[PDB]
Amino acid sequence: GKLPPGPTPLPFIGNYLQLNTEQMYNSLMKISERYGPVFTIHLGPRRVVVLCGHDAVKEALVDQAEEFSGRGEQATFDWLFKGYGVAFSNGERAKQLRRFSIATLRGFGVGKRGIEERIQEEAGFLIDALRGTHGANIDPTFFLSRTVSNVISSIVFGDRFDYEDKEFLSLLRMMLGSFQFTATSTGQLYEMFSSVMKHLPGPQQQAFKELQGLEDFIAKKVEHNQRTLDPNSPRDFIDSFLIRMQEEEKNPNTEFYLKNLVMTTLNLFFAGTETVSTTLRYGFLLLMKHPEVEAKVHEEIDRVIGKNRQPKFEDRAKMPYTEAVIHEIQRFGDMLPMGLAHRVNKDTKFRDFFLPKGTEVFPMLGSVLRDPRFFSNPRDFNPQHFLDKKGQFKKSDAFVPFSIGKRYCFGEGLARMELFLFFTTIMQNFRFKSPQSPKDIDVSPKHVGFATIPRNYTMSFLPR
């Protein structure tokens, strides 16, 4: 092999002395700024090829899609999944469960009228909850996550949760807690030194405890389902998997067994919850920071959908400004800045480099979402990045919040429908009020690591 150039590492600690665990994105970008957009870095004992900018990322993930379709490490989650489940797995296993998850979610109305209806109804219940706060100052966090979570929960568990179910709230905290840990300094230090840190006291233990509790929950729901299963009428994702497992009992090479079931279900429940929930939370903060933007959105809502009927996904075609604002919310939000790690599944010639089988690869989505060749004010919240001169919606090939290539988020259709329906349906009813003036609202992220987390804040939902 002939790996890209990079800073010389020390034994075991790797390039530790040249990385800021508190902001790995900037540290890697600082290093890019001197070795090129493609370089080698050593996270502790892990050798990783980093890709920065739309071009390097796009050349690998899309132009050589098959070769870069492997899955690399994500230490915190691997602690729990250990190669099982659809997301944090490789080869035939990732292939099967992905093929199956995709077909099953569609079977349950994802990307169709069915789920749009599910979302509309849940969007409904959220309005009730927010209106029931009667303009009181609140943390929107769990109001948003309970709503978001109910959509995917309807699909995997069969029905939604009551907004007051205490275990439900408990599960939401484990998710927010463990997801957030991966964004912190210790969470990133964990990506380098997990072989030593998993045995030491620290926030990593709390994160593990949380992951274990979510798995415990799922195994419980699986057992139940098993005893009341009707192999002729699947009620949810779990039944469909149980049925598939039934059919594959004879095959001793099948990927369809309980562990993959529990983990795949967790992947869907967790990602189906925390991602959209985090983007909505961030979005509101940005909207109250730019009242002028929330304004032009209301005007497009009232003018196209009206103050009467509930929004529908189809309305996005007549609302380029709202679509722009949402895209910009996602671009700015940069949820997974270093993306989710990939790895080459064979010896690969990439540019003037030769990456041996198994080499980890970080597709830095954050550097694509902020690429200066595609955005003029990469570091600012500006809805214009997605609107042309005439004021129409303008796509950008640098918009990759969902990644690209063969491992691209297959939950993308569902997320955009939820993002469009919750934002629009929420603002059709309310105007956002912050207890601080737009000038003092800090929209810089609270933590940036595996994920980008918004600062805590309270707000008021006042009727329009």
Ligand X SMILES: c1ccc2[nH]ccc2c1
Give the footprint of ligand X on this chain (CB under 6 A): 87, 267, 270-271
From CA 60, how far away is CA 66, in angstroms rounded?
9
**Strand 46-51 relative to strand 360-363: parallel, antiparallel, unpaired?**
parallel
Contact letters (x/-) for ligand HEM, 384-423, by CB under 6 A?
Answer: -----------------xxx---xxx-x--xx--------
Handedness of CA 386, 402, 104, 277 (dihedral sign): negative
* CB of 373 vs ligand X, minimal distance in Å: 28
Give the CA distances from residue 4 to residues 16, 50, 204, 332, in Å, rounded to whole numbers and listed in that order.
Answer: 18, 9, 32, 29
| Cβ atoms 68, 60 nearer than 8 A | yes
CB of residue 367 to ligand X, shortest distance in Å = 19
Per-residue contact string for residues 345-384; x = within reach of ligand HEM by CB under 6 A: ----------------------------------------
Q: Which is nearer to ligand X, 267 or 277 (CB)?
A: 267
Answer with the entry of ligand HEM, ligand X, none that 98 interacts with (C-beta below 5 to 8 A by kind).
ligand HEM
Which residue of the chain is nearest ligand HEM when measured via CB?
Answer: 411
Our CB check for ligand HEM shows the closer of 266 and 387 to be 266
Alpha helices (H) along 305-364:
320-333
Binding track over 91-120 against ligand HEM, x by CB under 6 A? ---x---x----------------------
Nearer to ligand X, 80 or 417 (CB): 80
Indicate the burial class of 274 (C-beta count within 10 angstroms; 0-12, 13-18, 19 or more).
Answer: buried
Q: Quote the CA–CA distance of 26 and 334 in Å, as a whole number.
A: 13
Residue 242 to residue 244: CA distance in whole angstroms: 5
- State how far the Cα of 332 lies from the Cα of 68, in Å rounded to an integer: 26
The tokens of 305 are what? Answer: 């959908």
Tell the smallest beta-carbon distance from residue 313 to ligand X (Å).
23
Q: Which residues 302-341 are close enough to bind ligand HEM by CB under 6 A?
A: 335-336, 339-340
Interface size with ligand HEM, residues (CB under 6 A): 26
Concatenated DSSP letters for 61-104? IIITTTTT-EE---HHHHHHHTT-SSSS--HHHHHHHHHHHHHH
Give the nearer residue to ligand X in terms of CB position, either 87 or 286.
87
Q: Which is nearer to ligand HEM, 31 or 280 (CB)?
A: 280
Rounded to a whole number of angstroms, the distance between the first and last alpha carbons of the chain is 62
Kindly provide the b/e burial profile for residues 438-454, where b requires at least 16 CB atoms within 10 angstroms of the residue's own CB.
eeebebebebbbbbbbb
Smallest CA-to-CA distance from 265 within 228, 233, 217 is with: 217
Query: From CA 143, how far away is CA 121, in angstroms rounded?
Result: 15
Shortest distance, CB of residue 250 to ligand HEM, whole angstroms? Answer: 27
> C-beta of 16: minimal distance to ligand HEM in Å?
26
Residue 221: CB atoms within 10 A of its CB come to 17
Q: Given the complex with ligand X, which of 273 and 428 has the nearer CB atom?
A: 273
Among the residue ranges 17-25, 125-133, 268-276, 282-290, the one whose residues contact ligand HEM (CB under 6 A): 268-276
**Is 52 annotated as belonging to a binding site?**
no
Beta strands in 126-191 (DSSP E): none
| 271 binding ligand HEM? (CB under 6 A) | yes
Considering only residues 76, 240, 279, 424, which one is a binding residue for ligand HEM as defined by CB under 6 A? 279
Q: Write out the binding residues for heme.
A: 409
The footprint of ligand HEM (CB under 6 A) covers 71, 86-87, 94, 98, 152, 267-268, 271-272, 275-276, 279, 335-336, 339-340, 401-403, 407-409, 411, 414-415
**Residues annotated in the binding site, as ranges?**
267, 409
- Tell me the binding residues for substrate: 267
